[PDB]
Amino acid sequence: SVSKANVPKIDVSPLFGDDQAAKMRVAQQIDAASRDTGFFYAVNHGINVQRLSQKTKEFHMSITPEEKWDLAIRAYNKEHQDQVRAGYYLSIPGKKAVESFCYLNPNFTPDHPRIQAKTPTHEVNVWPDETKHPGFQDFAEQYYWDVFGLSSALLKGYALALGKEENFFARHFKPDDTLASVVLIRYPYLDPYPEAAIKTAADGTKLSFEWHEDVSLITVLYQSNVQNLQVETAAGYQDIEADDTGYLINCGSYMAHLTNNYYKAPIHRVKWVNAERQSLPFFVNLGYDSVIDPFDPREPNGKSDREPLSYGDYLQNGLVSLINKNGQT
Numbered sequence: 299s300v301s302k303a304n305v306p307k308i309d310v311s312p313l314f315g316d317d318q319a320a321k322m323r324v325a326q327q328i329d330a331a332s333r334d335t336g337f338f339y340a341v342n343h344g345i346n347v348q349r350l351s352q353k354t355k356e357f358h359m360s361i362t363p364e365e366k367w368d369l370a371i372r373a374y375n376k377e378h379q380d381q382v383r384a385g386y387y388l389s390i391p392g393k394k395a396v397e398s399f400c401y402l403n404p405n406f407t408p409d410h411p412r413i414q415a416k417t418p419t420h421e422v423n424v425w426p427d428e429t430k431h432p433g434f435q436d437f438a439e440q441y442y443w444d445v446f447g448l449s450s451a452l453l454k455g456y457a458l459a460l461g462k463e464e465n466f467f468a469r470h471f472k473p474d475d476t477l478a479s480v481v482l483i484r485y486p487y488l489d490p491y492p493e494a495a496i497k498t499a500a501d502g503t504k505l506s507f508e509w510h511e512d513v514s515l516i517t518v519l520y521q522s523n524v525q526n527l528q529v530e531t532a533a534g535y536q537d538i539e540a541d542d543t544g545y546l547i548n549c550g551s552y553m554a555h556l557t558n559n560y561y562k563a564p565i566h567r568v569k570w571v572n573a574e575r576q577s578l579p580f581f582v583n584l585g586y587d588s589v590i591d592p593f594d595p596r597e598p599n600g601k602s603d604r605e606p607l608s609y610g611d612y613l614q615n616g617l618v619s620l621i622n623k624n625g626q627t
């Protein structure tokens with residue numbers, strides 16, 4: 299058997315309020331989880347995740363092949379050269395089981411200065427026809443802002459955890475410019491499940507997605523109640539329990555850089571499970587020009603021998619590297 303990873307449930311509700319001692323006690327729990335396996339469940343988060351899952355299922359199950367081509371990223375549709383990040387990521391029956399829909403900041407409109415400038419990593423979202431998917435765009439955009447709010451509260455907890463003022467990260471996480479993304483991932487049930495869509499780890503574990511660190515500051519993840527994630531610890535890969543009431547939280551490699559690996563970006567992977575399920579990450583990205591000076595909370599003077607890295611530089615390089623390492627999703 300594989301051991302169960304220690305993934306505590308942390309009541310994050312004080313991070314939305316004004317009780318500073320209570321927020322420090324949440325911050326300590328974040329610190330402890332970040333120094334241990336690197337994962338925790340945020341509970342009492344205030345988001346209606348059941349309705350998220352229902353609306354997402356309605357979308358995934360009703361979108362047609364025609365609509366998928368019409369929304370497709372450039373990796374699948376050469377006509378869509380502006381769609382690097384945002385749009386549909388098709389499955390390939392017999393070969394690639396997963397499919398997904400990514401969207402970015404709804405404030406990236408045609409008139410946004412970074413869209414006008416054609417700055418890398420910024421794109422205008424694409425949406426299916428309203429008549430075919432009534433209410434979907436509005437729901438999805440509202441979800442962006444709901445998860446943005448949760449993420450901002452979480453970032454206040456991380457800041458406090460690291461000995462900083464509570465706006466240390468949040469001041470760089472702003473509605474007008476955040477590079478954060480939502481991905482609505484569908485993992486299908488298939489009978490037969492094609493072997494070509496199943497990867498095998500060096501330890502023999504069947505996988506849907508190989509080991510990686512996230513490209514993010516933090517990742518704020520809702521999943522169905524089907525166990526699938528594993529985290530590498532000193533004791534080997536351990537199973538992360540599912541909890542479809544909570545959000546699973548981890549640090550990405552930008553946090554590891556800024557903290558000199560004090561809060562590591564945990565290495566994790568996705569087991570192959572032949573089940574119809576959802577994986578709905580929010581990748582908490584800062585603005586393109588956001589730079590936080592790296593530090594080290596283990597050193598008396600806080601100094602680090604890492605160089606400052608703007609978030610835009612980080613993100614553009616990281617997304618490419620993850621595609622090269624683990625394949626086009």
Ligand SMILES: CC1(C)S[C@H]2[C@H](C(=O)[C@H]2NC(=O)CCC[C@H](N)C(=O)O)[C@H]1C(=O)O
Nearest residue numbers: 383400479481483507519568577579581627
């Ligand atoms: C939550 C994950 C483990 S993370 C891992 C995999 C994924 O699809 C993985 N992550 C990525 O591919 C990066 C998506 C970035 C997004 N298009 C953007 O432009 O910002 C997920 C899963 O398979 O459940």
Ligand SMILES: [Fe+3]
Nearest residue numbers: 510511512566
């Ligand atoms: Fe991941």
